[PDB]
Design a protein around this motif. Structure first.
Motif, PDB file in Angstrom:
ATOM      1  N   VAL A   1      10.798 -58.828 -16.107  1.00  0.00           N
ATOM      2  CA  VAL A   1      11.471 -58.653 -14.825  1.00  0.00           C
ATOM      3  C   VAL A   1      10.556 -59.082 -13.681  1.00  0.00           C
ATOM      4  O   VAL A   1      11.005 -59.719 -12.722  1.00  0.00           O
ATOM      5  CB  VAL A   1      11.964 -57.203 -14.662  1.00  0.00           C
ATOM      6  CG1 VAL A   1      12.361 -56.921 -13.219  1.00  0.00           C
ATOM      7  CG2 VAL A   1      13.150 -56.965 -15.593  1.00  0.00           C
TER       8      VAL A   1
ATOM      9  N   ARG B   1       8.151 -61.306 -13.943  1.00  0.00           N
ATOM     10  CA  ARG B   1       8.126 -62.763 -14.034  1.00  0.00           C
ATOM     11  C   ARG B   1       9.358 -63.366 -13.377  1.00  0.00           C
ATOM     12  O   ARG B   1       9.272 -64.402 -12.705  1.00  0.00           O
ATOM     13  CB  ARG B   1       8.027 -63.190 -15.497  1.00  0.00           C
ATOM     14  CG  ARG B   1       6.662 -62.945 -16.106  1.00  0.00           C
ATOM     15  CD  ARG B   1       6.715 -63.047 -17.601  1.00  0.00           C
ATOM     16  NE  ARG B   1       6.962 -64.389 -18.122  1.00  0.00           N
ATOM     17  CZ  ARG B   1       6.013 -65.270 -18.433  1.00  0.00           C
ATOM     18  NH1 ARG B   1       4.724 -64.985 -18.236  1.00  0.00           N
ATOM     19  NH2 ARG B   1       6.349 -66.444 -18.963  1.00  0.00           N
ATOM     20  N   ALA B   2      10.520 -62.741 -13.573  1.00  0.00           N
ATOM     21  CA  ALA B   2      11.733 -63.239 -12.929  1.00  0.00           C
ATOM     22  C   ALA B   2      11.644 -63.137 -11.414  1.00  0.00           C
ATOM     23  O   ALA B   2      12.197 -63.984 -10.703  1.00  0.00           O
ATOM     24  CB  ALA B   2      12.959 -62.475 -13.445  1.00  0.00           C
TER      25      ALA B   2
ATOM     26  N   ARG C   1       9.847 -66.294 -10.484  1.00  0.00           N
ATOM     27  CA  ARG C   1      10.696 -67.481 -10.592  1.00  0.00           C
ATOM     28  C   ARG C   1      11.792 -67.481  -9.529  1.00  0.00           C
ATOM     29  O   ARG C   1      12.094 -68.532  -8.938  1.00  0.00           O
ATOM     30  CB  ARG C   1      11.307 -67.576 -11.997  1.00  0.00           C
ATOM     31  CG  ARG C   1      10.466 -68.353 -12.989  1.00  0.00           C
ATOM     32  CD  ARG C   1       9.121 -67.678 -13.267  1.00  0.00           C
ATOM     33  NE  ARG C   1       8.403 -68.335 -14.360  1.00  0.00           N
ATOM     34  CZ  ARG C   1       8.489 -67.977 -15.640  1.00  0.00           C
ATOM     35  NH1 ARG C   1       9.285 -66.965 -16.015  1.00  0.00           N
ATOM     36  NH2 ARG C   1       7.804 -68.644 -16.555  1.00  0.00           N
ATOM     37  N   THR C   2      12.390 -66.315  -9.251  1.00  0.00           N
ATOM     38  CA  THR C   2      13.404 -66.265  -8.201  1.00  0.00           C
ATOM     39  C   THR C   2      12.803 -66.631  -6.849  1.00  0.00           C
ATOM     40  O   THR C   2      13.411 -67.378  -6.075  1.00  0.00           O
ATOM     41  CB  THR C   2      14.049 -64.880  -8.159  1.00  0.00           C
ATOM     42  OG1 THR C   2      14.793 -64.657  -9.369  1.00  0.00           O
ATOM     43  CG2 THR C   2      14.972 -64.714  -6.930  1.00  0.00           C
TER      44      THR C   2
ATOM     45  N   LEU D   1      14.215 -69.443  -4.457  1.00  0.00           N
ATOM     46  CA  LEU D   1      14.656 -69.178  -3.088  1.00  0.00           C
ATOM     47  C   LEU D   1      13.966 -70.121  -2.122  1.00  0.00           C
ATOM     48  O   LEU D   1      14.608 -70.718  -1.246  1.00  0.00           O
ATOM     49  CB  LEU D   1      14.348 -67.735  -2.693  1.00  0.00           C
ATOM     50  CG  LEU D   1      15.067 -66.626  -3.451  1.00  0.00           C
ATOM     51  CD1 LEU D   1      14.547 -65.244  -3.009  1.00  0.00           C
ATOM     52  CD2 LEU D   1      16.579 -66.733  -3.268  1.00  0.00           C
TER      53      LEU D   1
END
Ligand SMILES: N[C@@H](CCC(=O)N[C@@H](CS)C(=O)NCC(=O)O)C(=O)O
Ligand SMILES: N[C@@H](CCC(=O)N[C@@H](CS)C(=O)NCC(=O)O)C(=O)O
Ligand SMILES: [Ca+2]
Ligand SMILES: [Fe+3]
Ligand SMILES: [Fe+3]
Lengths: 241, 241
Positions: free
Chosen positions: A100, A102-103, A106-107, A111
């Motif tokens: 989570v 790591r996400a 990446r998000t 963005l």
């Protein structure tokens, strides 16, 4: 042990991304400057057929960077390089281990790339209106952890992706670089100093304070001078809406 | 154990990316359609403040998708979701293990996002000339291994990222859906059937043949009907010269 050569340019925020990540990784690497916008060397398409900076070679025999080997892997696109460096240096923990978190990293990169980066480009190079850029920066600021820290908590490649652009914004604005109007220059300087953007100012300070930034930054005035070599930054041209 | 809910729409190639990755991972997950372009539910900003599809929730209590829990992680941006699913399901090998092969996958995704998608948008939403899109598609085709296989050799999330857009291109062209003229529509159809683009046709065939595509595709005619509901595709409208 495989060699890393990064083809770079001082003005380029995309190349700056990868220098920061290589510093954070503790990697051994070579940099080689390329005058990509004014005088591309005839051999440069051998390291990047897209003819963009950064370019990266990996492995192959050790050769001068202006004599690239066909045997080295040719890696293009700065965010792909960021993930590559994280993959090559797992002990450096350039990404979190938790999926989570790591996400979040990446998000944050997505963005920035999908909603902020094009606004920076269009405001600076085309003089489009600044309000959509400020709106996008407020959105990105909202993704940061409120109390402090970096995009995913601990420092990660997401922060290498974003700081080159945010760090250029402040001295470029002060030096009057860009094709936006006087009115939008004043608006952006006031906004970026206002309480609205306190969080992203702290983020910029925190990223700049790390050795990876200090050791890959020429200094504010020197970076401004490098940006003045960019042909698209036509001095004396401004767009008005 | 932690639940996955993907907020989706049949027309959406970005949502399609994530459905494909979830199928390839063998994940247990819920999909929930959102009429994001015509009638967004008032609760949808709780799962994605950007008001975009796809959106994902992860973990938290099992709740009806239209009553999202504050305790679930809220993940935005399709490519961040692809990397997230790879992280969650390592045994599914949704990325290579070799760093250079992984970088091929990340580069391919960046090539699509940075150089191809915006050309699809220009042609389909604005009706600008098709040649720059064909050039961008030939560039992307050139990054594939010429003798066969997927972007990184073995199938990876890079192919989940790209097939939704390429797979829509052919049936949308056959339906004449999009703001381009009949002339440019014929030009694109001829080009995409010519030997110039034999390799990308093989790529589309190879991706479409996988169950992950079959199980996430409504069928060509049905996908065209769903695309006609998209306001920006302006069904019945074409720009000329
Ligand atoms: N998407 C690329 C963008 C790279 C880029 O645009 N670099 C510029 C310099 S800052 C360049 O090389 N421009 C030359 C050109 O487009 O011809 C990345 O992330 O690496
Ligand atoms: N960068 C996003 C793009 C998502 C996107 O643009 N989704 C469209 C549907 S195809 C949407 O929700 N548009 C509504 C809006 O932009 O307001 C991603 O990769 O997920
Ligand atoms: Ca927030
Ligand atoms: Fe540049
Ligand atoms: Fe869409």
């Amino acid at each position: 042990t495989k060699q890393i050569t990064l083809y770079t340019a001082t003005f380029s925020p995309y190349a700056h991304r990868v220098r920061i990540a290589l510093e954070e990784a503790g990697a051994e690497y070579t940099t080689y400057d390329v005058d990509i916008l004014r005088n591309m060397p005839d051999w440069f398409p051998l390291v990047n057929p897209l003819k963009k900076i950064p370019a990266m070679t990996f492995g192959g025999p050790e050769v001068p960077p202006d004599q690239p080997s066909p045997e080295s892997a040719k890696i293009a696109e700065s965010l792909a390089m960021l993930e590559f460096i994280a993959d090559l240096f797992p002990d450096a923990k350039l990404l979190p281990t938790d999926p989570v978190l790591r996400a979040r990293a990446r998000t944050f990169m997505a963005l920035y790339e999908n909603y902020v980066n094009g606004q920076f480009r269009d405001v600076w190079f085309l003089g489009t209106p600044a309000d959509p850029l400020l709106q996008a920066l407020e959105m990105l600021q909202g993704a940061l952890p409120p109390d402090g820290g970096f995009a995913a908590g601990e420092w990660s490649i997401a922060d290498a992706a974003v700081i080159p652009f945010l760090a250029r914004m402040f001295p470029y604005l002060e030096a009057g670089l860009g094709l936006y109007s006087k009115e939008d220059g004043v608006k952006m300087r006031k906004a970026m100093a206002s309480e609205r953007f306190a969080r992203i100012r702290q983020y910029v300070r925190d990223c700049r304070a790390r050795p990876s930034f200090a050791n890959t930054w020429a200094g504010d005035a020197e970076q401004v001078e490098a940006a003045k070599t960019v042909p698209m930054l036509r001095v004396g041209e401004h767009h008005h809406h």
